[PDB]
Amino acid sequence: VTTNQCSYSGRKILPGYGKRMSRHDKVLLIFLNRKASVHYLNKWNPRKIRWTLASRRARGKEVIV
């Protein structure tokens, strides 16, 4: 089906889930759940949150193409 990738983590989002946010520099952000949206607003660094795509990439556990 048509899918999106969470902008905070790297997960896939299925039709009818999560919510979007329109930033004022004219950039859109797509969130998987409310947990992911609270992490972004508080300015918690994605690489320090160990379950994200960004963390596992920085830890060698995720292969970067």
Binding site: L14, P15, G16
Partner: protein, 378 residues
């Protein structure tokens, strides 16, 4: 003096009294009207509420702002194992309404039907239909007893029961219900059709069709004893009221010197008999078909049961039906489904592109157990 500003009353007086329902289950009080000449068909079925999901569908409307676009809609899932027809009843239209002629039962009656006749089954002495089975053994008695319904009745119904050993429920006794035979050419053709269904199973795909509308009848969620703010929706009083602000302040004028039945009072909320009408059918399938919930838009094989299982219901084993929207009751209430008495006229067709099978226990993100395994592949 006159009430200074204008404002309607709160709540609908046509759903009074707000008492607990005393009927056992939802009871179908009306049937769709018979049309002399129409093809014969059944009008009702009985299922159990399994769960909710949402779907993607392509809208084909005309003049609508969604004319050639995609919409996401909520659907409800109802579990419908086949019912067994066990008896035939006829009625006559008389100057006192509907009066019955006789009820003709089948020769051989199953355990789920026999348990509904007893309070405790293990302990009881079993003397239901003990004489009837002996007499009715030879099939001649049925033919003679059907020789009356052909001669005196205007309306024919079949008696049918569910099979609760094909569900995740706890009960072992069936739910018994009359189903009216509409259509046909005359009365005598509707009794040849009812006899050809005796002791046989009936599937829900042979009553309802896709895109038609139905009515759902059930008993609502219960909340027990509840005050006026929640029971009736009246305004909450200001903060510095001495003895509490969850009340109606004035419950009547001095005259008349009684409390009127139109005033909001506290009491039982929920567990009511209700009817929600005009529900469109989305899909009729079976859970044994492993391709039941797969559009082309996905390539894996998906079926009706979600990852994790239907929360607070259990597993679905056979046939099911899918209606748009919502219906009364919690999970596992029996729901009666009939044809729509006065259906909505401008409803578009049904064209499904995607169905959600992700987990409803929590916030599941995997359509199938197989691809969750590929995700955590170590």
């Amino acid at each position: 003096s006159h009430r200074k500003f204008s404002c309607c009353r709160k709540g609908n007086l046509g759903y009074l009294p707000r008492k607990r329902c005393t009927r056992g289950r939802g009871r179908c009080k009306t049937f769709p009207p018979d049309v002399q000449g129409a093809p014969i068909h059944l009008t009702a079925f009985l299922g159990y509420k399994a769960g909710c999901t949402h779907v993607m569908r392509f809208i084909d409307h005309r003049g609508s702002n969604l004319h050639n676009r995609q919409a996401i809609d909520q659907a409800t899932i109802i579990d419908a194992p086949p019912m067994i027809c066990t008896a035939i009843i006829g009625y006559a239209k008389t100057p006192k309404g509907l009066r019955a002629v006789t009820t003709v039962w089948a020769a051989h009656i199953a355990e789920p039907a026999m348990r509904r006749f007893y309070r405790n089954y293990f302990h009881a002495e079993k003397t239901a239909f003990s004489t009837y089975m002996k007499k009715a053994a030879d099939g001649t008695y049925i033919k003679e007893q059907l020789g009356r319904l052909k001669q005196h009745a205007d309306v024919i119904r079949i008696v049918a029961h569910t099979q609760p050993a094909l569900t995740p429920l706890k009960q072992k006794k069936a739910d018994i219900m009359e189903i009216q035979v509409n259509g046909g050419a005359n009365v005598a053709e509707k009794v040849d059709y009812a006899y050809a269904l005796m002791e046989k199973p009936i599937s829900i795909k042979d009553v309802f069709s896709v895109g038609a509308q139905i009515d759902t009848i059930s008993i609502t969620r219960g909340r027990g004893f509840e005050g006026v703010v929640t029971r009736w929706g009246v305004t909450r009083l200001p903060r510095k009221t001495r003895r509490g602000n969850r009340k109606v302040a004035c419950i009547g004028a001095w005259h008349p010197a009684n409390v009127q039945y139109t005033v909001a009072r506290a009491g039982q909320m929920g567990y009511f008999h209700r009817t929600d009408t005009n529900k469109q059918v989305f899909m009729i399938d079976t859970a044994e078909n492993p391709r039941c919930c797969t559009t082309e838009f996905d390539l894996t094989d998906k079926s009706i049961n979600p990852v994790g299982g239907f929360v607070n219901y259990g597993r679905v084993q056979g046939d099911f039906i899918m209606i748009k929207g919502t219906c009364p009751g919690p999970k596992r209430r029996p729901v009666v489904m009939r044809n729509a008495l006065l259906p909505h006229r401008n409803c578009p067709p049904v064209q499904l592109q995607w169905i959600s099978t992700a987990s409803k226990f929590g916030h599941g993100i995997f359509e199938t157990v197989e691809e969750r395994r590929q995700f955590y592949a170590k």
